[PDB]
C-alpha cells in the first residue's frame, strides 16, 4: 500500500476523463456514438484490467 | 508520507497539462501570448504554493 493508493487516484482520472467513451448513449444498441467500439484499458469493465 | 506521494503525482499533471500557461513565449517581454497573465495554483512558481 506504499504507493497503491496512487493507482486509485489515476483510476478516477479515467472515468472523469474517459467514461463517456463507454457510455450507453445509442438507443438502438448497435451503431456506437463515439464511432469507436474499443474499451480503453483505463476503464475497468472486467476484473482482469485491474492488472 | 502515507499519501504525500499522491501530491507529487498530481504535481506532474499540472506541468504536463498546464506548464505552457506560464512559459516565456513572448519575445518583447510585455504581452502574454495566451491572453492570460494569471498564474495557475497548480504550477509552483513560489515555495508558498507548496501548501
Ligand atoms: Ca500566462
Amino acid at each position: 500500500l506504499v504507493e497503491d493508493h496512487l493507482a486509485v487516484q489515476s483510476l478516477i482520472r479515467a472515468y472523469q476523463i474517459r467514461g463517456h467513451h463507454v457510455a450507453q448513449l445509442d438507443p438502438l444498441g448497435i451503431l456506437d456514438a463515439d464511432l469507436d467500439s474499443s474499451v480503453p484499458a483505463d476503464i475497468i469493465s472486467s476484473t482482469d484490467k485491474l492488472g
Side-chain angles (χ1 to χ4, degrees), chain A residues 1-47 49-51:
Chain A
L1 61 87
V2 62
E3 286 190 358
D4 311 342
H5 294 327
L6 275 68
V8 170
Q9 296 297 109
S10 61
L11 182 63
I12 300 184
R13 293 177 64 88
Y15 288 105
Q16 291 177 336
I17 311 180
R18 266 169 285 275
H20 65 96
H21 278 293
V22 302
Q24 315 153 20
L25 305 164
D26 73 3
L28 295 174
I30 33 160
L31 277 342
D32 55 272
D34 57 327
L35 296 185
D36 192 6
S37 318
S38 90
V39 179
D42 291 331
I43 297 89
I44 300 299
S45 66
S46 63
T47 308
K49 291 183 287 294
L50 271 298

